[PDB]
Design a protein around this ligand. Structure first.
Ligand SMILES: [Zn+2]
Ligand SMILES: [Zn+2]
Lengths: 267, 106
């Protein structure tokens, strides 16, 4: 675990602060009595300045003891390599984070086809994490992909994708029938519930939002990550009105890049 | 009577070993250079304006003051020494020493 490193760093900072506080106390007391214009302010200022340093020393010692209660249990040229490698990944990690936000491109032009196994392995690679999510693939009609994604005991999502580009989504509850009489996937149907219709609209807005121009895998990854947050539904209240119910509906809006519950009327 | 002699090296080294045993606290130089006699030059007239004037110790009685002194003091014109105006200890003080500076300083 890496918490011990932070605990040790905080202990070092605390002991340095304690030493600096003792030095400050003794220097400030050595300085002596000042002028402070009138007599009455001269009397109060020295005492006020003297009390604060001792209070700071006591507070630092108390927090140091609180941490003490909290804490618990050729080669050189090799290390010079290691301490360099971790210095690179972080250095680029910020630089990639600051250049993507300020995109200076104006147009893709100057002056689609994928193997089915590619899509299948990408979807499996998405499926390996998020153990609650379960994804099933089919192609009843042509090369278009139909995916059924089940979430917990709450959600069932039907996704129609056109050559790995997500195209259409319809969600339903758990007990509702998802298959047709023939046994195939039912594409054209409705959830017969207001909240599920509202979250279908939300999913349509989400798929209209996440749009990268030349990386299509990150788009479906972000969509799956956003859809992951819905498992906690009916247990979390809105961040503005406090109560769960507004006009008889529970919070059904999950903000992008900050996944917290919200009512639709609360924006 | 008229020695004209130089100290031997033994004295030099034994005083060299002295600071290894005795610390030298400090010293203060009294003749603070502030007079205009050492600043004026011949055929060089000086034009001075009002209020421009282009480790504080009590030099009479060896008393240390703070970083910024509290009580007002008096400054000698010629030597430039600074001394406290009203002495703190009067009921118990050397009256043979304090009475020698009431009128003027040397
Ligand atoms: Zn709300
Ligand atoms: Zn004098």
């Amino acid at each position: 675990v890496s918490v011990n490193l932070e605990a040790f760093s905080q202990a070092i900072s605390a002991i340095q602060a304690l030493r600096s506080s003792v030095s400050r106390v003794f220097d400030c007391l050595k300085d002596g009595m000042r002028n402070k214009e009138t007599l009455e302010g001269r009397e109060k200022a020295f005492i006020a300045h003297f009390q604060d340093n001792l209070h700071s020393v006591n507070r630092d010692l108390n927090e140091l003891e609180r941490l003490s209660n909290l804490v618990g249990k050729l080669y050189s040229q090799l290390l010079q390599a290691y301490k360099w490698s971790n210095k690179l990944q972080y250095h680029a990690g910020l630089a990639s984070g600051l250049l993507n936000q300020q995109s200076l491109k104006r147009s893709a032009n100057q002056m689609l086809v994928l193997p089915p196994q590619y899509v299948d392995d990408v979807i499996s690679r998405i499926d390996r994490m998020f153990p609650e999510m379960s994804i099933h693939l089919s192609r009843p009609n042509g090369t278009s992909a139909m995916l059924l994604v089940t979430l917990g005991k709450v959600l069932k999502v039907i996704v129609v994708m056109r050559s790995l580009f997500i195209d259409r989504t319809i969600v339903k509850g758990y007990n509702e029938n998802v298959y047709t009489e023939d046994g195939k996937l039912d594409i054209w149907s409705k959830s017969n519930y207001q909240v599920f219709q509202k979250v279908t609209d939300h999913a349509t807005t989400a798929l209209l939002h996440y749009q990268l121009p030349q990386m299509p895998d990150v788009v479906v990854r972000s969509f799956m990550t956003w859809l992951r947050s819905y498992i906690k539904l009916f247990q979390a209240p809105c961040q503005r009105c406090g109560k769960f119910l507004q006009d008889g509906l529970p919070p059904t809006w999950r903000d992008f890049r900050t996944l917290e519950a919200f009512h639709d009327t609360c924006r | 009577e008229g020695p004209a002699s130089e100290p031997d090296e033994a004295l030099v080294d034994e005083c060299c070993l002295l600071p290894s045993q005795l610390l030298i606290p400090s010293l203060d130089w009294l003749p603070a250079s502030d007079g205009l006699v050492s600043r004026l030059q011949p055929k060089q007239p000086l034009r001075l304006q009002f209020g421009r004037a282009p480790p504080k110790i009590d030099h009479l009685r060896r008393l240390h003051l703070g970083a910024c002194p509290t009580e007002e003091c008096k400054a000698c014109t010629r030597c430039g020494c600074v001394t406290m105006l009203k002495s703190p200890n009067r009921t118990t003080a050397v009256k043979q020493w304090e009475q020698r500076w009431i009128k003027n300083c040397l």
